[PDB]
Amino acid sequence: LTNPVPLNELIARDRRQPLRFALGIMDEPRRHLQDVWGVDVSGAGGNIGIGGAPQTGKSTLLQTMVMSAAATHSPRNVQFYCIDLGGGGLIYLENLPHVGGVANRSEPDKVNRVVAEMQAVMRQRETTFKEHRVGSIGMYRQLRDDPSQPVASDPYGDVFLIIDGWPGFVGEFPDLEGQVQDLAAQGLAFGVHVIISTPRWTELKSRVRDYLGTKIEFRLGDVNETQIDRITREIPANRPGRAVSMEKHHLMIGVPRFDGVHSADNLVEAITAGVTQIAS
């Protein structure tokens, strides 16, 4: 599809599910139908890897993901921490109560504090789950919905670390790579998630990439480097927002706006209007 669907229409057309974030439109070609596509982050799809050549729509998808999550979940249950090294676009998400912080190049201390905070949660969750005899993240999410449970005082729910621009991240923060690897491989059992974009899959090493259970792939510089399959060869050139994912169906990512406008024009202004509208 060429014109992106705005989030207000995607949310409205979607059958909502806890920890389902609607993201765009999936062409399901056997029958002629085109439904709302999203990600289930409640289980093994909880970590997400995003690949694609320059200007293909990686940062916009992250904006759409966070806005979509924030429009359909409470800030008590979903929190995002953002490391923005992919164009600066994540800053316009920071006034959402779901977003605990957006860190960029101009404040390296915050990039370090953000990773350290994700580690603190996962590492507190490990002790908490044992001491409170919590059998699974699924059970932990239920217990937190009961205000009489000791665990319900945890202000955190499912916590997502977003890294837009992996090679620049490892390039400027080499010692944080190992900490993020540990979050990706151990976090999901404790409700700690990792979401990473990269221009090339080869720059996102196995030991991290293998723990991103949902891969989303825009048009690649080298189709031989796909993390999906040969379907990626079908993505049209110069169509930002066109992607493929694990179900091997073409996708058109929607836009992070709520004003009914089917384009990515004037998006900075529309994102803020969306955040305001989400305040409901």
Contact string 40-69 vs Mg ion (x = CB under 5 A): -------------------x----------
Residue appearing with tokens 């001491």: 131
Q: How far is the CB of 198 from ligand ATP (least distance, A)?
A: 9
CA-to-CA distance for 243 and 53, rounded, in angstroms?
11
For residue 24, how many C-alpha atoms fall within 13 Å in the half-sphere facing its CB? 29
Instruction: Identify which of residues 63 and 72 has a Cβ nearer to ligand ATP in the complex.
Output: 63
Task: Give the footprint of ligand ATP on residues 41-70 (CB under 6 A).
Answer: 52, 54-60
Mention every residue, 6+ apart, whose C-beta is less than 8 A from residue 240. 55, 56, 57, 60, 218, 264
User: Torsion angle, CA of 260/263/264/266, rounded to 10 degrees?
Assistant: -60
Shortest reach from residue 275's CB to Mg ion, in Å: 19
57 labelled as ligand-binding?
yes
Count of CB atoms situated within 10 Å of the CB of 137: 19
The verdict on whether residue 254 carries a ligand-binding annotation is no
DSSP for 211-226 reads: T--EEEEE--S-GGG-
**Residues 72-101: x where in contact with ligand ATP by CB under 6 A, - otherwise, as a string:** --------------xx--------------
In whole angstroms, the minimum distance from the beta carbon of 59 to Mg ion comes to 3
CA distance 209 to 219: 18
Strand, helix or coil at 198?
Answer: strand
Query: Is residue 240 within the footprint of ligand ATP (CB under 6 A)?
Result: yes
Tell me which residues in 3-22 interact with ligand ATP (CB under 6 A). Answer: 4
Smallest gap from residue 56 Cβ to Mg ion (A): 9
Is 61:244 a contact under the CB 8 Å cutoff?
A: no
Q: In this complex, which beta carbon is closest to ligand ATP, that of residue 53 or of residue 143?
A: 53
Choice between 157 and 240, CB closer to ligand ATP: 240
Binding site for ligand ATP (CB under 6 A): 4, 52, 54-60, 86-87, 199, 240-241, 253, 255, 264
Q: Which residues are annotated as a binding site for ATP?
A: 52-59
